[PDB]
Write a protein that binds this DNA or RNA. Structure first.
Ligand code: QUI
Ligand code: QUI
Ligand code: QUI
Ligand code: QUI
Ligand code: K
Ligand code: MN
Ligand code: MN
Lengths: 8, 8
DNA sequence: ACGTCG
DNA sequence: ACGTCG
């Protein structure tokens, strides 16, 4: 849920 | 993830 | 259940 | 020369 590299 | 030159 | 740049 | 999460 975090999106720092993916944002899922 | 680190931004030391890109910051992704 | 998700992976990234100069 | 450096790693970023709910
Ligand atoms: C987002 O909150 C979150 C938490 N755990 C994960 C595990 C695997 C893929 C994506 C996820 N996203
Ligand atoms: C994004 O591509 C990415 C990959 N690995 C991680 C590990 C821990 C926190 C955040 C991350 N983000
Ligand atoms: C950030 O933590 C991080 C780690 N590895 C990477 C590889 C390629 C592009 C960006 C990256 N960012
Ligand atoms: C920033 O543009 C950049 C390019 N190469 C690196 C190599 C190692 C650590 C940090 C770096 N930052
Ligand atoms: K982001
Ligand atoms: Mn991964
Ligand atoms: Mn690394």
């Amino acid at each position: 849920x975090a999106x720092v590299x993916a944002x899922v």
